[PDB]
Design a protein around this ligand. Sequence first.
Ligand SMILES: [Cl-]
Ligand SMILES: [Cl-]
Ligand SMILES: [Cl-]
Ligand SMILES: [Cl-]
Ligand SMILES: [Cl-]
Ligand SMILES: [Cl-]
Ligand SMILES: [Cl-]
Ligand SMILES: [Cl-]
Ligand SMILES: [Cl-]
Ligand SMILES: [Cl-]
Ligand SMILES: [Cl-]
Lengths: 156, 156, 156, 156, 156, 156, 156, 156, 156, 156
Amino acid sequence: MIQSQINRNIRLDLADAILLSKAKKDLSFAEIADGTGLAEAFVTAALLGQQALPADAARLVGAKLDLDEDSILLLQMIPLRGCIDDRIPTDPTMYKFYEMLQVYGTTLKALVHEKFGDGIISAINFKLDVKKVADPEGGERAVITLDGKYLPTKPF
Amino acid sequence: MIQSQINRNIRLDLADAILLSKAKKDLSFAEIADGTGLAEAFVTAALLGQQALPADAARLVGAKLDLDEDSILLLQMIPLRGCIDDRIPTDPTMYKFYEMLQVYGTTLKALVHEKFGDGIISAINFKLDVKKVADPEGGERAVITLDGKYLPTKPF
Amino acid sequence: MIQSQINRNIRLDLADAILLSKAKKDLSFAEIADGTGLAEAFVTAALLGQQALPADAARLVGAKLDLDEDSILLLQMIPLRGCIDDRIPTDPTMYKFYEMLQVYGTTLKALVHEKFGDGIISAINFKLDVKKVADPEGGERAVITLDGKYLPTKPF
Amino acid sequence: MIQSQINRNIRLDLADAILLSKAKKDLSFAEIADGTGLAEAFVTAALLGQQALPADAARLVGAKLDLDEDSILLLQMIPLRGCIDDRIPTDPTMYKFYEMLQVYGTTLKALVHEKFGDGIISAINFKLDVKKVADPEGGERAVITLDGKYLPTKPF
Amino acid sequence: MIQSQINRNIRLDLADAILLSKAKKDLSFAEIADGTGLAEAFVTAALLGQQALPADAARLVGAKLDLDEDSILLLQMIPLRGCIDDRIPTDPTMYKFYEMLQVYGTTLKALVHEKFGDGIISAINFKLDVKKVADPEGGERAVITLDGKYLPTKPF
Amino acid sequence: MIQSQINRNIRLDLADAILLSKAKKDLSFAEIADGTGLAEAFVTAALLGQQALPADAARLVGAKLDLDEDSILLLQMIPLRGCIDDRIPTDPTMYKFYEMLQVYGTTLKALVHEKFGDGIISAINFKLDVKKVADPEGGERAVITLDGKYLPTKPF
Amino acid sequence: MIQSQINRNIRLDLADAILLSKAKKDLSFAEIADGTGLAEAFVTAALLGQQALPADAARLVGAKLDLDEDSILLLQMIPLRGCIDDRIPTDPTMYKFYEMLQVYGTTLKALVHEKFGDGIISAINFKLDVKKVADPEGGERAVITLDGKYLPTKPF
Amino acid sequence: MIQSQINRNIRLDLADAILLSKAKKDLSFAEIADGTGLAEAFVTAALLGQQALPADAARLVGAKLDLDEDSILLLQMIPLRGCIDDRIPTDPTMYKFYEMLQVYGTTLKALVHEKFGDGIISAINFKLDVKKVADPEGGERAVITLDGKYLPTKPF
Amino acid sequence: MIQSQINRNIRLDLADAILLSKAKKDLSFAEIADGTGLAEAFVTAALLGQQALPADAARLVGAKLDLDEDSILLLQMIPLRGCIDDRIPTDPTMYKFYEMLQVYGTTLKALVHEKFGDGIISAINFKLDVKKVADPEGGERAVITLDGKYLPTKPF
Amino acid sequence: MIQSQINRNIRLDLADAILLSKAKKDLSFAEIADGTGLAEAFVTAALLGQQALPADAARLVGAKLDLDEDSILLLQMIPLRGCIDDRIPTDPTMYKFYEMLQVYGTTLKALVHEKFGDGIISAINFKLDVKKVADPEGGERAVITLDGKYLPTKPF
Ligand SMILES: [Cl-]
Ligand SMILES: [Cl-]
Ligand SMILES: [Cl-]
Ligand SMILES: [Cl-]
Ligand SMILES: [Cl-]
Ligand SMILES: [Cl-]
Ligand SMILES: [Cl-]
Ligand SMILES: [Cl-]
Ligand SMILES: [Cl-]
Ligand SMILES: [Cl-]
Ligand SMILES: [Cl-]
């Protein structure tokens, strides 16, 4: 039977223990998500308390990280989602995504309505991925792809 | 000589004036960006107060929207950027982007450090586009691509 | 061409003007929505800056309330949604709905997960209605029906 | 003799103990509420620290979840209600109920005053239920019914 | 037909107009409420935008303050209630009532539960009055009486 | 010699222990303050961390609740007062009192200045009591009396 | 009859007009307060919207600053007090008094409870002055005296 | 070698242990500071985590309160200063000093600039004392003196 | 006589006026500060409402920007300082100085105490300059130098 | 393989442990960073949880401070950065750098755009140093140099 959480700190504590294990084993997130059938981002978001793993993926990543039974079971719980400590990120890496919203949120609204119509892009019916790409000027670029279903507001 | 703003309300007031004129003339953002050299997202951001237009583009959009000279000039100022009224958006369209951060923010961090290293994805060396694609299962998907340069932290 | 807002105050200023005109003419919301083809909840929300009316409905309610042409046009814009002044309602009537969330919000989470799965009830593919019902123990009850599409989260 | 709580953290910690014991036993909220004489939504709220169970119900559920006597006693205490961590939910499932308020809160005010009068719909003399039903267009909808007593403001 | 507001500022602006008028006429609130059939605190609350006046009362107080027709009309509207600018009062006279809550809030909960049970003291079915008495050790005391209906929460 | 706290959490954890003790022994707040020479509301506030008990009261309540000697001593310190977790109450019982302030707070200011003059009603030279009184329309009413010294501002 | 305000902006806008007049005329606060029978801290605070001037004083300053009669009448009304824009000063001169509270706030408490007892030092029955006095080590110090009554807290 | 803190809770936890010890032994702050050569306000602020003791003072107060060597050493650390839990005090005693700033804050600024000039009054080159002075009209007055160097701003 | 401000919006509104004027005349801050005797950073801060100009400088920049006499006089007032609209900057250029404090805040504390001792670095006895230095690796750096006086805290 | 953190408290707790060890051994930060290859500001930031140490440096400082292996590993993780407890610093030493931003933030934007163009100064590609210079007038000045790469904004 589906089980769900109501206090994010139970899964966030476990996130921290997972990350300590990961480090001691010198693991990558790519290699933890290998063999689960599930994208890097999805599996990583789960370890970090933001998705549920199916029973088999839970058992497999739990094997790779030496997790007790209670942990493997926590990973299959539907989480109380929300990874930002207090609304606005302090961490520069995370912050720059928030800054993208402070610069473009209204343009994104404006252009979503023009191209699709009244309503929203889903973050539920949704995938993302992060791709490292060569910058043609030297260095590297991240291509983060947000792929969500257009959901129209339709009048009643 | 480059000129800059310190109070966002001046450009955000102009943005409202622009949208009314835009509505009266029944224009699209695609049409307004036509003949500027500049991507739709970049030109939309500027009208909405989040980017400067070069003089030529400013005159060009300004003639389309029948803007006065002060307005054409304001559009060339470097803005006091920040489009969200009060940190967290109320508007469902804008809010879903914020929610993507609440679900994936720590995943984006984790994976950025794994793939690139210690540093950040730029919001300044950056590009975004919004693309509509049909959904195999019916409907339209929005694919929003955030494209930023990786900037490493290096020890000193 | 679809036109969208970015500053809630334009439509909220217009809502206040509409509400004064309404009261001068001694109209109900029922009678303003009558003839539009649209549900009284929808037309009301539109008046109050939270939905867009189609042009014909905008002209009808325009004529009823004696609104000018720019006002009828504003009523057709896709709003910057968000009716609460500062996140938490101060008004007792509005506040009690919030209070229902403070009491039942985790129970709603738990029961959505058990009855539907991992995901959300949509507020976009959505309708609500308010019905007066006699209370067998004297007086009147409000039955408020919130009706939204289940959107699952599925792993990727 | 009636007993009451002043710090939510005591029943919320108990909430988390309950959900782990629930998860370990692979129980459902429906089967914990069975035999209590009480709605599923009522008993769940109580598990999650938002209502008091009567001693008979507290004893029945405590023996389902193997809880100690101090816990069975806590469940009968009148709680310090408020399930939301910091005012605005971060969890998308919970958040969408809040989003319903951001969009329709003033419509609900307007329509309660129109249909009932000056006053409020009670969150106390109140019930709720959640039903799953097929959507004629395909998929499933949730029907959440909020059923409260109208309490008039009467002048003095 | 009943009419209601959704932005407190329209009625708060009218409050400031009422009070300038009152000052110029050197009127008290006792005198404005006289002949109204309504308690001083009720009529005052209404002038200050926190209650609605019946039509006769509104015309009567408007006669005494020389208010235009729209104003007399605004006083009959159901207000968007909430007199505190930004949640916590800055003004020392108002702040003390807030302080009484910081000191006695939890005692009031405890003693409401013990004396009545699980539920709330109504703020809607409610009367308020302020009485000046002599202090036995010299000076004056304020005896403020909050008189609200007990509404139990009962299981469902 | 007089002893005082600077962090509310010491006394509030103590309150949680007191309430647990109290619940086991199935005591009321009536019976705990009995024998104390002090008003029910004063003694309850003290147990809840919002008042100091004198040593004899501290001893008498400590024997009834079976508290250790360090606790009986803590009960005697002058508290770091402030019972609301985070400024606004989430609990519907405590919240109605905050709502009374949102509706009537400016009316209280206004009427205080009219009856007494420029200054404040004391919450330190203060008492409160709660009484049940049957409502002749049916059920029960809570009559809460707030009784505070008037303290004028006088120019200097 | 005493008149009072409920919106601070009305008196704060007047403070701004007073200050520009005061500058045009190159006046000091000492000169404005002279011949008034009142301390410069008191009179200045009134001009700044935080105290009420008695009628005589009000007419005296109003003459100095060339104020209209509505402004002289406003200076006699009882203000909605609170001079800090948003809880915490941004101004370095003002902020430093706030920093004195962050460093020494708990000490002040501890030492008021030691020297006087349970209770508070008044900000209402209160005098304030500011002296420039040379520093024996060189330069100038500021000596600011907060002279307030001790208001005890005792059982009931 | 000078040592400093970055997390206030280490010294604030110690502060609570000091106060429990102080109470158990029934000491006063005047007697803890006596023999130290240091002003009572200074020594008290250090005990409460807002100043650092020199090593001999740290040893001397540690003897009187029976503290361990880890504690005595902590007392000598330069603290992370900030005694107010969350910006605005909840405690009536501490709050009144905050209210003094809400009333007199702009006046203190206006009178600093008049009497000294453009700059600030120091909270660092600063002392404060608290004297009891009986009132001509009866009871006692607290005369708190804030004595800080004046630091001008001057153009560069 | 020294004249000071107490509402930042008067000088910030002027700041905007100055900025439009500046842009119309296509002037740099470098050139406006020329001839005033004052550092470009000082003169710019003044224009932006964060410093006062001496009469002569105010009349010079006044001539340059075509300001009227009330303005030239506002430029000479001691401002109510604080340039950030709502505590945390939204603008990427201003935000990165805030991020400097989030990353290095505690390091600056720790190193200040190690190198100078207990106390602060002044932001009043202070100056800053911004200098463009070529980066060896390609492009440009800004070297921003903050030059403040060490003000010790020492006991009393 | 690179390891990163998502919860600042793990490393902020280690920072507290480091500082106590550091206190006990009476070390300075200059000594701890000696032999590290790395600047003092860089290494201190790392101990305080705001930078990652390369393995050799981690091993060195761990030896000096007697840190266990889990700790030496932690210091190599990429941190969840953000040293400020709750956005605005309470500590006077930290606070003055925040005030520099409230006074000069917009001046820094302005001069950055004039001297470099549209864009930001990096806090990532960044060096920071703190130096003591004798004050020609008497005492010591702190010169903090912030040295960051300029990152331009250009249209796409
Ligand atoms: Cl969604
Ligand atoms: Cl960037
Ligand atoms: Cl949705
Ligand atoms: Cl209710
Ligand atoms: Cl249900
Ligand atoms: Cl109610
Ligand atoms: Cl008081
Ligand atoms: Cl008081
Ligand atoms: Cl200082
Ligand atoms: Cl300073
Ligand atoms: Cl950067």
